[PDB]
Amino acid sequence: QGSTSKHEFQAETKKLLDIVARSLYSEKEVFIRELISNASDALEKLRHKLVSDGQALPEMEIHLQTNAEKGTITIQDTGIGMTQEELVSNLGTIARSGSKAFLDALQIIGQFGVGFYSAFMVADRVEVYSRSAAPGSLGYQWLSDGSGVFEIAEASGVRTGTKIIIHLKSDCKEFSSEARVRDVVTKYSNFVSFPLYLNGRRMNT
Amino acid sequence: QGSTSKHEFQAETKKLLDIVARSLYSEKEVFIRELISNASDALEKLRHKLVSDGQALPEMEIHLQTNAEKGTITIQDTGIGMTQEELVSNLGTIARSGSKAFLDALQNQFGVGFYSAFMVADRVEVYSRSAAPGSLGYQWLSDGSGVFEIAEASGVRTGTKIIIHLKSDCKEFSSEARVRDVVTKYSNFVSFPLYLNGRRMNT
C-alpha cells in the first residue's frame, strides 16, 4: 500500500519531538544570556546617544537579583528604556511569536527580539518595568500573568532603563538560587561591555 | 493555573514541527534539485578523473524524463557511478536516516538530503554502473515495503539512473509542464548541459 507524501511529512517531523524538546528544555537557562545581552545593548544605545551629545554618563550597570523565597529572578539595566508604546508593541509581538522563536533557536522594535521568548518558557508571570531615557518620561509596567491577556499601567518610582521580574515556573525554581545562576552569569558577563552584578556582587572584570 | 516549563517546551516543539511539516510538504519539489545536484557532482567526478588522466571527454549530460502514464520521473547521468557495495551502503543508510535529514532541514552519490526523494516516492529504483573498466551494472530497489533488494542489471549504462514512482499526492512531478519550471530554474546551477525529455533546459 502507498502512503501520501503529506502524511509522511507529518510523521517524519513528529519523530523529532523528543530530541528537539529535550534538547531545548535542557538549555532553557539561555533566557539569562538573552536578557543580559538585551540589557547591555540598551545601555550602549544610551551611552552612544549621550556621548554623541556631549552629556555626562549616569551609572551604567547591569544588575541581576535572585530571590529564593519568592522564586524570582530580576534583571535590571539603567539604559535607554522603552516608551509605553514600545513596551506594548515589543512584548506583545514576542509573546505571539513562539514558533518563530523556537525555529530561530534551532537555526522587531524595542529592547527585545524573538529570543526573549526564552523568558516566557520559564515564567508563570513576567513583569517588565521601563522608563525611557528621554527627559520627562513616565515609567510603565507591562505584565503577563499567564492568562490570555497582557496589561499596561503607569508605574512611578520606576528608574530610567528597564527592569524585568520573572516569577519562575514550578519546575524552574533553580533559577532563583544564587548558586545555580552564578555560574551562568559569570561566564556570560564576559561578553558585555558594562559592569554586571549579581545580588550586589560584581561578576565580570 | 501555571504550567510546567517541560510541558510548554513539548507543546511549542510540537506546534513548530507541525508548521514545518506543512511547509516542507509545500516545498517537496526540492527532491528534483537534490537529484540534479547529485547527478552534476557525479559527472564532475568522472570529468575530473578523465581530465587528470589526459583522456578526451565523452558526452557529459544530465537527462530527466517524465512519464505521465506511469506516474514516474527519471534522472540519468553518465558520471562516475557507484559500485554494488556503494549502492547498498549509501542508499540503505539514507533510507534509514530520515530523522537526520529532517533535523538538517530544520536547523539549516548521495547525502541524507536524498531522503527528499523517498518523501515523494512509492518506489525508488537506482541503476548504477561504476566508471571503472570491467564494472557490471546493478539495480537497488525500494518498493515501499520494509525491505530493499539489490540485483545485477545488464544494459545499465556507465553512470547512475534513478526512477521514482511517485506517491498518490505527488503525480504532478510526472507532468512535463510542472517539472519544466522547477528544472529550468535549478539547471542554472549545474556546470553540465541538462535535458528534460530530450530537450535542453539550460544555456
In the block, cell 527592569 appears at: A163
Instruction: Establish if A150 touches chain B: CB-CB under 8 angstroms.
Output: no
Instruction: Establish if B1 touches chain A: CB-CB under 8 angstroms.
Output: yes
Top residue of A1, A7, A13 to mutate, by most chain B CBs within 10 Å, is A13
Looking at the partner chain, which of B14, B28, B108 has a beta carbon nearest the beta carbon of A107? B108
Please, which residues have CB within 8 angstroms of residue B126's CB and are 6 or more apart in sequence?
B87, B91, B139, B140, B141, B160, B161, B162, B163
- Rounded CA separation B165/B179 (Å): 15
- Rounded CA separation B132/A69 (Å): 74
- Rounded CA separation B53/B45 (Å): 13
Joined grid coordinates for residue A32: 539569562
DSSP SS3 for B44: helix
Annotation: CATH topology of B1-203:
Heat Shock Protein 90 (3.30.565)
Looking at the partner chain, which of A24, A124, A172 has a beta carbon nearest the beta carbon of B13? A24
Instruction: Establish if B181 touches chain A: CB-CB under 8 angstroms.
Output: no
Contact B28 A16 (CB under 8 A): no
Instruction: Establish if A146 touches chain B: CB-CB under 8 angstroms.
Output: yes
DSSP B57: P
User: CA B82, B83, B85: angle at the middle one, nearest 5?
Assistant: 120
Top residue of B4, B7, B9 to mutate, by most chain A CBs within 10 Å, is B9
DSSP SS3 for A202: strand
- Rounded CA separation A4/A23 (Å): 30
User: CA A29, A35, A39: angle at the middle one, nearest 5?
Assistant: 150
Q: For chain A, which residues make up each domain, given as ranges? A: 1-205
Joined grid coordinates for residue A24: 531545548
Joined grid coordinates for residue B10: 513539548
- Rounded CA separation A186/A74 (Å): 16
Please, which residues have CB within 8 angstroms of residue A24's CB and are 6 or more apart in sequence?
A102, A105, A106, B9, B13
CB contact burial B49-85 (16+ within 10 A = b; e otherwise): ebeeeeeeeeebbbbbbbbeeebbbbbbbbbbbbbbe
Annotation: CATH topology of A1-205:
Heat Shock Protein 90 (3.30.565)
Resolution (A): 1.8
- Rounded CA separation B31/B64 (Å): 13
| Rounded alpha-carbon distances, angstroms, from residue A29 to A2, A127, A201, B198 | 44, 18, 20, 58
The separation between CA A109 and the C-alpha centre of its own chain, rounded to angstroms, equals 14
Q: Which of A117, A75, A111 is nearest to A94 (CA)?
A: A117
What is the end-to-end Cα distance of chain A in Å, rounded? 66
Q: Alpha helices, DSSP H only, in chain A?
A: 5-14, 17-26, 30-53, 84-95, 98-106, 117-122, 178-188
Q: Are strands B72-77 and A62-67 parallel, antiparallel or unpaired?
A: unpaired
Which residues, in sequence order, are bridge partners of residue A62?
A77, A196
On chain A, the residues whose CB falls within 8 A of the CB of B106 are 16, 20, 103, 106-107
Looking at the partner chain, which of A5, A28, A124 has a beta carbon nearest the beta carbon of B119? A5
Experimental approach: X-ray
Please, which residues have CB within 8 angstroms of residue A11's CB and are 6 or more apart in sequence?
none
Q: Which amino acid is at B161?
A: K
- Rounded CA separation A123/A134 (Å): 30
- Rounded CA separation B82/B87 (Å): 6
Q: Count Cβ atoms within 10 A of the Cβ of residue B160 and give its class: 0-12 exposed, 13-18 middle, 19 or more buried.
A: buried
- Rounded CA separation A147/B41 (Å): 55
Contact B10 A24 (CB under 8 A): no
- Rounded CA separation B36/B192 (Å): 10
In this structure, are residues A74 and A164 in contact, taking their beta carbons and an 8 Å threshold?
yes
Q: What are the percentages of helix, strand and coil residues in chain A, rounded to 5?
A: 45, 20, 35
3-state SS of B122-188 is EEEEEEEECCCCCCCEEEEEECCCCCEEEEECCCCCCEEEEEEEECCCCHHHHCHHHHHHHHHHHHH
Joined grid coordinates for residue B196: 528534460
- Rounded CA separation B67/B72 (Å): 5
Joined grid coordinates for residue B60: 557529459
Q: Are strands B62-67 and B72-77 parallel, antiparallel or unpaired?
A: antiparallel
Looking at the partner chain, which of B2, B108, B169 has a beta carbon nearest the beta carbon of A4? B169
- Rounded CA separation B150/B84 (Å): 8
| Rounded alpha-carbon distances, angstroms, from residue A73 to A118, A202, B111, B148 | 14, 17, 46, 56
What is the end-to-end Cα distance of chain B in Å, rounded? 63
Please, which residues have CB within 8 angstroms of residue B202's CB and are 6 or more apart in sequence?
B184, B187, B188, B190, B193, B194
Q: Nearest 5°: phi and psi at B148? A: -100, 155
